[PDB]
Amino acid sequence: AQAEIEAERKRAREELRKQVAILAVAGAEKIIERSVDEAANSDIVDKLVAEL
Amino acid sequence: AQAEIEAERKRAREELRKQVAILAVAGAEKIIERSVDEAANSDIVDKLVAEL
Amino acid sequence: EFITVARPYAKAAFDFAVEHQSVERWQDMLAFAAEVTKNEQMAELLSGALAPETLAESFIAVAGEQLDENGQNLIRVMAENGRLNALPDVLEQFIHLRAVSEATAEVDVISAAALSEQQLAKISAAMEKRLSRKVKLNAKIDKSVMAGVIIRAGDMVIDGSVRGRLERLADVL
Amino acid sequence: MQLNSTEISELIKQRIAQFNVVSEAHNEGTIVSVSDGVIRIHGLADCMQGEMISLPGNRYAIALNLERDSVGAVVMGPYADLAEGMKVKCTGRILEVPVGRGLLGRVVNTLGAPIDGKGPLDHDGFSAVEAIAPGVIERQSVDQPVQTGYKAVDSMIPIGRGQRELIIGDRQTGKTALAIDAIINQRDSGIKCIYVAIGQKASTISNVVRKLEEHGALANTIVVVATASESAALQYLAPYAGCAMGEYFRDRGEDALIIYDDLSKQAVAYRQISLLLRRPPGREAFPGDVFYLHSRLLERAARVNAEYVEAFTKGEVKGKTGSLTALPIIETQAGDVSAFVPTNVISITDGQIFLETNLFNAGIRPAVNPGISVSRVGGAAQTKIMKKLSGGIRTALAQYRELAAFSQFASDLDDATRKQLDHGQKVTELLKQKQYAPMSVAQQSLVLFAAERGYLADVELSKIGSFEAALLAYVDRDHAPLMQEINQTGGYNDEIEGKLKGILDSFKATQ
Amino acid sequence: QLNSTEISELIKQRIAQFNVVSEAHNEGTIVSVSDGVIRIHGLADCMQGEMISLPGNRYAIALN
Amino acid sequence: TGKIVQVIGAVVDVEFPQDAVPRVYDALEVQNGNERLVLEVQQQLGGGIVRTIAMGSSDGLRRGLDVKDLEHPIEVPVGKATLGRIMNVLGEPVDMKGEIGEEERWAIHRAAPSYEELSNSQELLETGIKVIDLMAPFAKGGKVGLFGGAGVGKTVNMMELIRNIAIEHSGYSVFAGVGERTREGNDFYHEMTDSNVIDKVSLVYGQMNEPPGNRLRVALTGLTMAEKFRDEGRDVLLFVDNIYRYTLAGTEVSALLGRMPSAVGYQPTLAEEMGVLQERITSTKTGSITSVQAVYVPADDLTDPSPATTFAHLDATVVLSRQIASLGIYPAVDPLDSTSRQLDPLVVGQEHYDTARGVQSILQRYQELKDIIAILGMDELSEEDKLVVARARKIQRFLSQPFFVAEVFTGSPGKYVSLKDTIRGFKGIMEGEYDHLPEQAFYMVGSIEEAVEKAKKL
Amino acid sequence: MATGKIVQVIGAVVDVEFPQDAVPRVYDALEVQNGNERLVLEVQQQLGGGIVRTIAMGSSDGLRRGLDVKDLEHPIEVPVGKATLGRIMNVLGEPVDMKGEIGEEERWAIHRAAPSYEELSNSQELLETGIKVIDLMAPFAKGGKVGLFGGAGVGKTVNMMELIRNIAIEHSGYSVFAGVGERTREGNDFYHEMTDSNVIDKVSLVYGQMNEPPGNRLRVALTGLTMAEKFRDEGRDVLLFVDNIYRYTLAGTEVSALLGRMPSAVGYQPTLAEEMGVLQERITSTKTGSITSVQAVYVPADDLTDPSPATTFAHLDATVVLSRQIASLGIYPAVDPLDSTSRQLDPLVVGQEHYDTARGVQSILQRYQELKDIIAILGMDELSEEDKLVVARARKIQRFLSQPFFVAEVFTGSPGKYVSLKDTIRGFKGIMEGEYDHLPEQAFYMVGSIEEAVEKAKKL
């Protein structure tokens, strides 16, 4: 079962990389009631995807 | 042996959540530090003084 | 630290100054007496084992800025007990008791960048409702916060900095 | 399947959405001193005694003094990285702990932070760590048995729901063995269990948790741990955090069982906290109020009547009485039960089980020393059958253990003392029991019948264990349903005594 | 650091007049009460072992 | 009018205007959240400061709270209306019934009766307990103390004395539970109520849950109720469940009140704190208080200051011991250490006195032999010292008795033994007329006839 | 740049005053030039007003008030890793032999948190030392603590060398020896007894002997420990010797008195159990490695109730007692089987055969004790023929507990033997249950396994 856990872990990790870029933006725009565009921050979210 | 597998599931799940959570906050911090500009700062302060 | 032994002397000096209307002269008298305690050559003397009346009379000599009866009498009373080093704290608690009696407050406003001088008016007006006292702002600039403002009034703070918001969110998770 | 990333991400997203960006006003102070775990804060005009003060990092201090100018506090964690000048913030909260039934099966720090790697708690709000127990009119008398597994304690030192029963002895005597064998047995009787480890070695705690999980008991226990490394304030406050979690079940009309692993090490941690604050010590250098420490703790293990449960729960629960049973463990140097702290605690509990190292080395295990061990509620906490069969057995063995030490040379009424120190010695041979082998009340009852009614006068000591091993299988073959019948009920009748002689005879003739 | 019965209004008196105007050395005033010991302020001429007379008809022995 | 200025544990400091300062032992009141807290002032410090003890939980108190000066000491309901009801230390009702319909309230701080008013009474009082009224008989209106470590039987003994005196006695009775288990207070309250004697007993409870102020002052409340019943002309029973907790609660508070420690960490005022209480619990010409007090002995050390200073305040001292209870011999009274003022030939008669002295003599001679018996064994004894040892062990057994309240522990039914019936039995054992019975024939029986019978059945 | 100034100096305690914002944290190090040479101060307490109270890791003579103090931003850091094998270091990790710089690559702070609950090894293994008496009567848990209660003259240090050797050769671990406050002479002659038995290449030494100031003798135990932790992080199994834990306790008491804290139970510091636990808790097994420890213990006034013994015994797992008598019989190692104990001896952990074998040999020996007591007063012939048999078997068991160490060849000339546990079980099962009754008792002396006792007898 440990090996199935490792497989599922790699799998879900490759899934979450999509989500981190969502959560970071939602957090930033919650903390500041000003919504914000993407383009000005593109290489930040792109590094967040990669650095997970 | 079955309980020992359930524990490992729970524990790997928690670790995987921890990573994404701290990346969410770090990303929101970088975005914030990149996106703020004087109108937004004033928008924040001018609101907080109203509930002050 | 002399915070606890200063309280009696601060209260007594303030009551006396209030009765005789000379609060503003007493504050200057205490400021000078506290300044002579910081001197390199005097802070040596105060540590010695001189007798109280000799230490007082050699301390009184270094100050002609003291109204001869009462301002010197305070020094003599303090010297009896061996507390002349408490003057730099009697001064601060005298200032605090005065600020209380004159219902005045001094609130710090810490910001990432200076405010518009129209914002400050609103902040001060709002605080003067938060407090019964007439406020005096002293705004400052700090780069650790990066948006919003910190208002610190005594030991009560109202925190609207984005920095505080980030580090308060991180703990929710 | 169940590591869905969508589940995780929505978990986080809900918090992000459930976030109050609103600013809040709070009261502030500065750290002015640091030494040996004690903090001295200047400011905090609005601090209240017993409060939680929050330091940088994520850690708390507890306010112990409100001096005229400064607040004295103790740090609940590593304090070494604090420094003068740091700011601190006053919460509005008197020291609090997460409580709920969601804690069952979790290993938890004394502040409620989970220390197993399984992530955040699910819990039903918070409870104050310091409280005053229910008053005299809210209690009820203890009337329900709590079966451990052991012939010795279930028959000589009965324990009842709502009782407090000290386990006292020397080191390496089977104290923890007996306590977790008490936990494991409640696995199947609707009692929630709690185990508080104070000042224990971390590896030993991991071994205990691993044994609880081995026998399936862990799903039913809360484990609060404050290891030998952790700050003295966490060890000092650990058992109050455990009672705060036990009282959740009590006040809701349920039953719980709580085990304080070493209340000697709590007393030591409190003595440290107290000497570091310059308080004048008393006997054995313990503070003046080391009685009040254990007193206000163990007095919370109570049984509360139905009206208290109704009033507390706003009428949700009707006609049920809650309870919380305690089994504090004390450690004595060289068998001294007349020291300061062992006798302070013998004076707070409703009995004691004294485990003697001479019996333990001779193989008599559990080494229950009758004549020093007692139960202050007595038979009222037993089933009817056990209450009849046992009787004076413990005073019988106190007799015997004076008499066998006096008659170390020779005897009189040699035949009479032959058949006395036959049974007054085969009892001791009978009450010894293996570890992790609990035996139901049915099984203990006929055994005490065999012993007490004189049937063992016909057997040599070396045979007793064989005798019982055979009898408990005999009655699982032949008299199979009477066991089921005694397990449900207290079950005593002259019919039952007759049938219980008919059980002996049909076996005694066919070993 | 702790006070020694230096308190607000006594200090204020001394502020207005350090050389206490000659006052009866044959009397003083209680400043503290606890567990049967009273601290008296004044009594310049009290002698050790002397009897001090309190309101009512009671006495104290001056020991310190 | 006052402000709080410090909060250390159970003691609180309050600052009042210079001319409004409270008197010692007055009561102040604070609003601790959604609660009302009572403070009793202990000391007047300089400058309008006054130092107090909190009669409640100290948590939650901020500095700067406003406290209200009630201008009177703590006062408790008193008299016939306080009868059959449970009360707080503050005189508040603690059972769920209504308010106490008292006509009068008394201050719990009082002076002891004058020497001129005391009274002296040789009227012996019988209790159906062999050892207590052979070795240490006590009189109507006298004081009794039960000294013992932890877990040796000084509460079971007190409940049996309650059974044997306080049901067979007409006047009222008072029970003060100072710093003991609430379980036992509940058990006692229901044992009373389920036999209808509750409505002649008044209860006060300051049990061990409660913060130091309650355990400190709860004894004076019971005494105040008993003194009211005494002054009405009645005669009263007063049972105090552990008087040691009244001074331990003083040791806890002492250091915070700024008093230097004394011999073993005790407050410096130990003997005065104890005397000013023990002195008002006495009979007088107008009425009499008969009392029984349980006196815990820490670490089993009878020379500790707190037990040591108490022996002087009691007329009958019954000293229980662990080295006897661990033989299963109950009541575990030590006859070489129990004593009574009443044990005189002129008070109990020559035969009772002489039997008691002979019993002490035998048991002491038996103590002297234990070291040689332990080293050289029992066969080196003179042919008549073996007889002393046999009669001493028989006497040690016969001192045991089955109590009615200890049925729950042992099954065996209780026994009541009259004095006439016990001096006869001990005179018999000493004169040698039961030398043919075995020791066990004497363990846990009533009179001597029941021993002569038990021997038949082994 | 340096920012503090000395304010007080009292014995070994020094108080230095910093700017209000730059106060050092606790356990941070400081340094001052005490004349020509630097002196290191360890912060213990932060008093009010920027003043911080410290204790000197060296003699404080010659310190003036107003000396400039420089704040190092970190706790005492010592060199760790393979570079330290065969080198002697003092508390500060400075080389104290004459061989020059330690070539280390890395330095660790000596103050550390114990392994978190979720790092601990999820199993309970045993350490096979290869010494028959120890492996039978008092097995070592891997990651346990072990007391060593021998006196003097019985060969404590040759046992230590035997373990230092076997744990390096048979397993592939290293070792650390921390000398806490013991005679310098012993340390020097131990350093020589190791260098000429070739084990010096496999052990790391650190020495804070009696001559040193209290601050040195207090922390030196942590230096050895933080070197053992480095060897553990490398995945190895380590063995850590503490030459007297009692002197660690006493150094704590001295420093506590210097700081002015109130005296506790028998004069011991108030922080006694925490000071012990924060050491004993860092040495455990772990998912990546393990540290075992053999700690010489000394009991004041022979009182096993004194707070220091009582606190240490809560942490020990095994306990081996050396005996003058067993050495006078010429039997080595001089371990006493009847007083030696381990709490690993339970069927649930060690198995039923090992447990019952150990209990068997113990019963045999403690009966032979009373038999040999009888013999001395009534002569041999008074004994039954069963008792003569028990004597003949006890003597063979007592011989078979001897062993030739690799390190003792200097003494006995016979080549050393490493005896597996399996073999000890087989051999003692044999000797007890009447097999091997047919060959002489000297065939067991200093032999090794039993398949060598039969061959020694073959030609005896």
Ligand SMILES: Nc1ncnc2c1ncn2[C@@H]1O[C@H](COP(=O)(O)OP(=O)(O)OP(=O)(O)O)[C@@H](O)[C@H]1O
């Ligand atoms: N009923 C029993 N039968 C046989 N062995 C037992 C029994 N109970 C306990 N033991 C053994 O006693 C040993 C010590 O027991 P245990 O650790 O529970 O004592 P302890 O009081 O917890 O010791 P410490 O106080 O050091 O924690 C254990 O190894 C256990 O195997």
Ligand SMILES: Nc1ncnc2c1ncn2[C@@H]1O[C@H](COP(=O)(O)OP(=O)(O)O)[C@@H](O)[C@H]1O
């Ligand atoms: N007459 C008696 N018969 C049997 N047991 C008794 C008797 N008297 C006391 N005991 C035992 O004494 C133990 C101690 O109880 P208790 O009297 O409450 O002690 P304490 O005096 O400290 O409250 C009881 O649990 C009970 O078993």
Ligand SMILES: Nc1ncnc2c1ncn2[C@@H]1O[C@H](COP(=O)(O)OP(=O)(O)O)[C@@H](O)[C@H]1O
């Ligand atoms: N295993 C052994 N083999 C041979 N001789 C030994 C052995 N152990 C001890 N000895 C003898 O006993 C002596 C013990 O000396 P040493 O190791 O210095 O003990 P200690 O350091 O405790 O004084 C050895 O020098 C040797 O004479």
Ligand SMILES: [Mg+2]
């Ligand atoms: Mg244990």
Ligand SMILES: [Mg+2]
């Ligand atoms: Mg009691």
